[PDB]
């Protein structure tokens, strides 16, 4: 959208952030009382790899290798633990101009045993104003 052009462009993408958690019937040697799996995915299995470079999951410092990196679908990390925490998620885009990444702070929370397992869903909408034509291609093949 330069002044002497008549068109402009706006494309919106939907991402789903979520996790599942259930009490391990059998604790771990270290005392991890739960098993949880957190993911970043696109609604109805539409391939977001067209425009996603990689997803980075920053785990609490109590995990070994807390910076978990997912360069290819599915974008998830399966772990075990004992308490709920905030997990920040970075999504890096196949784009040569900023916007390059977006961060979300995800609430990884665990239910007590004797309560149902957690399956939690967060849907997030992102809006790209006048993207480059090559990134607009990627965005709109998904």
């Amino acid at each position: 959208r330069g002044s002497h052009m008549a068109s402009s462009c706006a494309v919106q993408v939907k991402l789903e952030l979520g996790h599942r958690a259930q009490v391990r019937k059998k604790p771990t040697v270290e005392g991890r009382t739960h098993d949880w799996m957190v993911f970043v995915r696109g609604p109805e299995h539409s391939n977001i790899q067209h425009f996603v470079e990689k997803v980075v999951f920053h785990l609490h410092e109590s995990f070994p290798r807390p910076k978990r990196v997912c360069k290819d679908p599915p974008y998830k990390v399966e772990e075990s633990g004992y308490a709920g925490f905030i997990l920040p998620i970075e999504v890096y885009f196949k784009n040569k101009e900023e916007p390059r990444k977006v961060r979300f702070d995800y609430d990884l929370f665990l239910h007590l045993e004797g309560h149902p397992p957690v399956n939690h869903l967060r849907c997030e909408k992102l809006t790209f104003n006048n993207p480059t034509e090559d990134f607009r291609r990627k965005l709109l093949k998904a």
Partner: peptide, 8 residues
């Protein structure tokens, strides 16, 4: 409440 302790 129904969820567990949280760490930080």
């Amino acid at each position: 409440t129904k969820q567990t302790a949280r760490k930080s």
